Amino acid sequence: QGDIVVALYPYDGIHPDDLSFKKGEKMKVLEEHGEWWKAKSLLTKKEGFIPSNYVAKLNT
Known part of the structure; x- marks a missing residue:
């Protein structure tokens, strides 16, 4: 679905x-892909691989 x-x-x-x-x-x-996933930046709409320890749900 897309998180x-x-x-x-x-x-x-x-x-x-x-x-x-x-x-x-x-x-x-x-x-x-388990501990690693591919996301995209809503700013530059760029997509790449991101670790599951540098980003998370909401925050500040």
């Missing part, structure tokens, strides 16, 4: 598919 998560910690695309997100930023996951 919405908010960047809890800034991420600078260090990988080829890792999507970069900045704390306070919101992201949506289009697919879950």
Whole structure:
């Protein structure tokens, strides 16, 4: 269905598919792969891979 998560910690695309997100930023996951999923930035609509320990549901 697609879950919405908010960047809890800034991420600078260090990988080829890792999507970069900045704390306070919101992201949506289009697919879950266990501990890793691919989300997209509502700001630049960019999509990449995000860890399940840097982003979460809501926050501030």
